[PDB]
Design a binder for this molecule. Structure first.
Ligand SMILES: [Au+]
Ligand SMILES: [Au+]
Ligand SMILES: [Au+]
Ligand SMILES: [Au+]
Ligand SMILES: [Au+]
Ligand SMILES: [Au+]
Ligand code: NA
Length: 155
């Protein structure tokens, strides 16, 4: 089953709401960042009961990277001068998640059969327009391969 996917969907949902919204001050964004941080901890808690560290990483990191990408987009477009500190820096001291999502994805596809939740999580971020290093090239053949390939792992 999963209380996990319910948390993941909710993180995704609330993020999409933030971008769609016309006016956010830094207050609201901040409030949103902290709610995601609360959720991540419950997400990790639920994961570490059943799964390896590496598997939690494979699931949490892409989620953080999804959120950072979209908030970084909003922050750039935004009239208001809103600020965003990278979650992927906060949890993992790296900022190259535009790439790292795809190394995780490649591992998930090449290196083993991991629990289904790893495939679902990448799938979900991709079905929500996470581009990472392909932001300029939506039709990059590797990028399209990733989409087709992870989806062939789910029901
Ligand atoms: Au964890
Ligand atoms: Au495979
Ligand atoms: Au989709
Ligand atoms: Au799809
Ligand atoms: Au190919
Ligand atoms: Au699979
Ligand atoms: Na730093």
């Amino acid at each position: 089953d999963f209380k996990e996917i319910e948390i993941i969907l909710d993180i995704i949902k609330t993020t999409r709401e933030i971008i769609e919204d016309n006016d956010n001050d830094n207050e609201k964004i901040s409030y949103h960042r902290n709610n995601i941080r609360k959720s991540i901890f419950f997400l990790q808690e639920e994961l570490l009961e059943k799964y390896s560290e590496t598997v939690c990483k494979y699931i949490v990191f892409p989620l953080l990277a999804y959120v950072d990408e979209k908030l970084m987009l909003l922050r750039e477009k935004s009239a208001s001068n809103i600020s965003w500190s990278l979650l992927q820096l906060e949890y993992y001291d790296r900022k190259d998640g535009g790439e790292y999502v795809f190394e995780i994805t490649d591992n998930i596809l090449s290196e083993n059969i991991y629990p289904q939740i790893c495939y679902q999580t990448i799938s979900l971020i991709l079905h929500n327009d996470f581009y990472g290093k392909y932001y300029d090239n939506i039709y990059n053949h590797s990028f399209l391969a990733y989409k087709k390939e992870i989806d062939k792992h789910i029901e």
